[PDB]
Amino acid sequence: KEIPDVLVDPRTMKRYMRGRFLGKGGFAKCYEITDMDTKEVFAGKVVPKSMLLKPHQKEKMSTEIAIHKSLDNPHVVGFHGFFEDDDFVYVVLEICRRRSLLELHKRRKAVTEPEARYFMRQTIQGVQYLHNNRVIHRDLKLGNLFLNDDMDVKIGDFGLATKIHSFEVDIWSLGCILYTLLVGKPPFETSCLKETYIRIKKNEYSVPRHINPVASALIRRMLHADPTLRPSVAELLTDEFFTSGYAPMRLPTSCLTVPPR
Numbered sequence: 196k197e198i199p200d201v202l203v204d205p206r207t208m209k210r211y212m213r214g215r216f217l218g219k220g221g222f223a224k225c226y227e228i229t230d231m232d233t234k235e236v237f238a239g240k241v242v243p244k245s246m247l248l249k250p251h252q253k254e255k256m257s258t259e260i261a262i263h264k265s266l267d268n269p270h271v272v273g274f275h276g277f278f279e280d281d282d283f284v285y286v287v288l289e290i291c292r293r294r295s296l297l298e299l300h301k302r303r304k305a306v307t308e309p310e311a312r313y314f315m316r317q318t319i320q321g322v323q324y325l326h327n328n329r330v331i332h333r334d335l336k337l338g339n340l341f342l343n344d345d346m347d348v349k350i351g352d353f354g355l356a357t358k359i360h361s362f363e364v365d366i367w368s369l370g371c372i373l374y375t376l377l378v379g380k381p382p383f384e385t386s387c388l389k390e391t392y393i394r395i396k397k398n399e400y401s402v403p404r405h406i407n408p409v410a411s412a413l414i415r416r417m418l419h420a421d422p423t424l425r426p427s428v429a430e431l432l433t434d435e436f437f438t439s440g441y442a443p444m445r446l447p448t449s450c451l452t453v454p455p456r
């Protein structure tokens with residue numbers, strides 16, 4: 196079943212030209228779509244109705260949309276309206292051309308300390324907006340932290356997001372991200388999936404002695420066994436880690452392959 200070259204919706208009555216392929220997410224396929232009247236570029240999520248044959252699966256997508264649609268923040272991926280034809284459900288989203296923070300990680304390994312400050316700050320500022328509007332992401336990872344042409348972090352993928360465990364699970368996820376950025380490897384990384392959960396439950400990680408004592412102190416608190424003893428989003432911004440060392444306000448595109456100079 197072919198995805199149409201031109202994507203039109205009954206509501207806005209706008210035409211979207213399906214351009215270059217971008218990737219796939221389980222059952223969804225992403226394409227770079229262009230508004231045929233305004234020439235504005237968007238990331239279009241295309242999901243076939245055969246993937247949502249069961250009404251239960253149709254719930255999770257409508258819940259994700261309801262949460263994402265209400266969101267408006269310079270650090271959250273912009274929602275720009277969803278629609279459907281009989282074959283596919285289309286979600287028009289903000290385009291992030293420099294991929295996610297995952298592709299940067301795999302290419303870079305351990306990033307420099309000032310970079311981590313920039314990336315965490317912008318991510319945490321986005322997480323703050325979510326938590327203020329009573330939204331828990333619940334699945335924060337490097338792949339969800341998208342990057343545009345200005346290297347700005349934009350949080351996306353709200354497939355497990357909820358609106359009101361609570362807020363402190365997002366703090367935990369951010370602790371893993373800060374670890375991975377600074378160390379170069381995930382804190383609970385193992386080839387076996389079953390092992391990873393035992394690693395998480397027993398809280399089995401060890402920050403290598405090479406990491407900044409101030410940075411390791413923040414990571415430990417973010418990954419603390421007691422969820423109530425984890426720092427709040429507001430407390431994260433003001434931590435020594437951000438205030439002590441150099442923190443750039445802009446990063447070059449070179450950071451995708453090489454350390455800044």
Ligand SMILES: Cc1nn(-c2cc(Cl)cc(-c3ccccc3C(N)=O)c2)c2cc(N[C@@H](C)c3ccccc3)ncc12
Pocket residue numbers: 217218219220223224225238240241272288289290291292293294295338339341351352
């Ligand atoms: C919003 C939104 N969602 N996606 C999106 C949508 C689906 Cl269905 C799949 C994937 C995806 C494909 C392969 C690996 C990983 C992923 C993933 N991050 O889940 C990504 C976007 C993609 C882009 N830019 C392109 C250049 C890009 C391609 C690959 C990775 C990152 C960015 N910009 C905004 C969005």
